[PDB]
Design a binder for this molecule. Structure first.
Ligand code: HEM
Length: 187
């Protein structure tokens, strides 16, 4: 019924595939490997920037701007001595509909879930919230409620059937994009 639940079903496979891809790149084998993972996160933030700063979406999601993680990820790349990668502008210039944008935000916000596990694994590489893993630090209100607050708004929006299709497309496209970014930074 809820939009969030439908999106969860629709992206269950892409998620399993993505989780497997991440495990295969061995992000915690070394700081260099971890840095390549941070580079992928950083590039995904560049794709999402125009959405987190969009006035229309900011009105729908109060506090939107502060959900971005670009400064932290860029600071982490600097800590790790990894040069910042160049964004290809493909998503920023894609001219996404509002509905597609909701699917991209769904995936970006959802990608924060379980980050405490990644944060814990980063400790093995002697990294933490003040060095190298700044982008995985837990948010103020806590990961849980941050997600619950976002989903309540998402599920309340009224969309027509075409817009629902576009939101699903946006979520699918975002999962595929993160995978492309990982293949790029680990190449
Ligand atoms: C770019 C997309 C995403 C990436 C890169 C991603 C990656 C991951 C990874 C690698 C893990 C395993 C963490 C660990 O090592 O323990 C994971 C766990 C998880 N992901 Fe995602 N994810 C993404 C999007 C999403 C979305 C959209 C949702 C939800 C709508 C989601 C929900 C979860 C949850 C619930 C867990 C398990 C958390 C727990 O066990 O407490 N993820 N994800």
């Amino acid at each position: 019924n809820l939009r969030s639940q439908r999106l969860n079903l629709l992206t269950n496979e892409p998620h399993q595939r993505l989780e497997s891809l991440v495990k295969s790149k061995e992000p915690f084998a070394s700081r260099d490997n971890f840095a390549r993972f941070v580079a992928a996160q950083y590039l995904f933030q560049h794709d999402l920037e125009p959405l987190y700063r969009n006035e229309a979406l900011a009105r729908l999601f109060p506090g939107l701007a502060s959900r971005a993680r670009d400064d932290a990820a860029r600071a982490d790349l600097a800590d790790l001595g990894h040069p910042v990668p160049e964004g290809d502008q493909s998503v920023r210039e894609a001219d996404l509909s509002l509905a597609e944008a909701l699917g991209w935000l769904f995936v970006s916000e959802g990608s924060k879930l379980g980050a405490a596990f990644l944060f814990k694994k980063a400790a093995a590489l002697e990294l933490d919230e003040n060095f190298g893993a700044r982008h995985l630090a837990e948010p103020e209100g806590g990961r849980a409620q941050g997600w619950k607050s976002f989903v309540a708004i998402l599920d309340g929006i009224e969309l027509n059937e075409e817009e629902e299709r576009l939101a699903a497309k946006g979520a699918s496209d975002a999962f595929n994009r993160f995978g492309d970014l990982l293949e790029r930074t680990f190449a």
